[PDB]
C-alpha cells in the first residue's frame, strides 16, 4: 500500500476539466458514493491492490456504476490475474518470436497524441496467421497482448500524465487496414475475439480513440450501418477512414510524434521494433523505473 501511494502520488491524478464524467476529478455526488461503496465491499472482500479511485473508477464507468457489478467485473479481473500470472507477466514471458511476427503484422506504440495518450499503431495488410503459427501461437500472442497492457499501465501511462500535466488513462490506436482481403480478416477473428475479451474485462476504459485508417469499403460501409447498436461514448471514440486519413490524423497527433508513413515527420532509424515515448525520457520516468522492452 505504502509504495502504491507513492506511485500514484508521482504523477498527476486528476483528468481535464474536459474529460467526461465519472472521471477522476469530475464525479457527481453520486458517482462519490458509489466509489465509496465499491471501495469499502471491496475492502471486506479481502482486496488491498488496484483500490485507487482512477482503477475503480474505470470499473464503475464499465458498469454503469452499478456496484455491484463493478464489484463483481473486479472480482473476475483479480482472479483472472491469479490464475493468468498476469502480476508476473513482465518477468515470465518472452516474446522472442517479435522480430519475425512483426514482418507479418506490425504492433507498435510511438510517441503521444495531442491530449497526451500514447499512440498504438497496427498495420494489417500482410497477415498470414498460418505463417506466423510456425513462430507463434494464439496463445503466446495473447500472452504478448497482457504483457503490452502492462507495461502500458504501470510504466507507459505514468510517464505520459507527467508529461501531459494530467492524469492519462488511455491510448490512441491507429489500425491501418490497407491491404487486407474480408477472407484475412475473418480468419483473425478468433484473436480479434479473444483480445477483445481481455480488453474489455481485464482493462476496462483504457483505450481513448480508435481510428481505423484505409477502409474498405465494404468495411466501413457495414461499421456506418451497424453503428446505431454502439453507445453513443464508444462510438465518439471511433473514426472509420478511407485512403485520405492523413489530415484527420494530424488533427490529432503532433506532425513531429506522427510517423512519416502516415503523414507526419517522425523518424526511426526500426519502427516496428521501436518503443519511442516520454516513458523512454528521464525527465519523466518516475518511482516505477524505465519500462521493459520487448526488444
Ligand atoms: C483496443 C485497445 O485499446 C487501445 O487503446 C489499445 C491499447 C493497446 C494496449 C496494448 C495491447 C494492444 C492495444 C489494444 C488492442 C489492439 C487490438 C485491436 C484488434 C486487433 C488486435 C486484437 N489488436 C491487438 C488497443
Known amino acids: 500500500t505504502q509504495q502504491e501511494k507513492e506511485f500514484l502520488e508521482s504523477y498527476p491524478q486528476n483528468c ?3 474529460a467526461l464524467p465519472g472521471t477522476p476529478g469530475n464525479l457527481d455526488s453520486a458517482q462519490e458514493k458509489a466509489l ?3 471501495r469499502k465491499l471491496l475492502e471486506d472482500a479481502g482486496f488491498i491492490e488496484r483500490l485507487d479511485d482512477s482503477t475503480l473508477l474505470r470499473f464503475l464507468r464499465a458498469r454503469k456504476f452499478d456496484v455491484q457489478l463493478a464489484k463483481e ?12 500470472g498476469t502480476d508476473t507477466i513482465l518477468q515470465d514471458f518472452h516474446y522472442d518470436e517479435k ?3 512483426a514482418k507479418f503484422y ?19 495488410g500482410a497477415v498470414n496467421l498460418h505463417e506466423m503459427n510456425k513462430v507463434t501461437s494464439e496463445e503466446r500472442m495473447l500472452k504478448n497482448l497482457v504483457w503490452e497492457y502492462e507495461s502500458v499501465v504501470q510504466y507507459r501511462l505514468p510517464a505520459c500524465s507527467r508529461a501531459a500535466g494530467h492524469l492519462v488513462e488511455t491510448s490512441c ?16 477473428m478468433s484473436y480479434v475475439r479473444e483480445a477483445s475479451y481481455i480488453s474489455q474485462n481485464y482493462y476496462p476504459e483504457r483505450m481513448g480513440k480508435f481510428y481505423i485508417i484505409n477502409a474498405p469499403f465494404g468495411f466501413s460501409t457495414a461499421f456506418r450501418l451497424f453503428k446505431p447498436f454502439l453507445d453513443p461514448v464508444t462510438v465518439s471514440k471511433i473514426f472509420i477512414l478511407g485512403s485520405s486519413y492523413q489530415k484527420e490524423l494530424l488533427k490529432q497527433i503532433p506532425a513531429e510524434n506522427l510517423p512519416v508513413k ?12 521501436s518503443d519511442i515515448g516520454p516513458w523512454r525520457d528521464p525527465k519523466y520516468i518516475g518511482p516505477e523505473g524505465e519500462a521493459p522492452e520487448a526488444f
Open 16 to 18: 481535464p476539466p474536459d
Open 36 to 38: 465509496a461503496e465499491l
Open 73 to 84: 467485473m473486479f472480482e473476475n479481473c483479480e482472479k483472472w490475474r491469479k490464475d493468468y
Open 99 to 101: 522480430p519475425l511476427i
Open 106 to 124: 506490425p504492433q507498435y506504440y510511438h510517441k503521444t497524441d495531442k491530449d497526451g495518450r500514447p499512440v498504438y499503431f497496427e498495420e494489417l
Open 173 to 188: 490506436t491507429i489500425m491501418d487496414l490497407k491491404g487486407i482481403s474480408i477472407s484475412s480478416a475473418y480468419s483473425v
Open 262 to 273: 502516415f503523414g507526419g515527420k517522425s523518424e526511426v532509424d526500426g519502427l516496428y521494433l
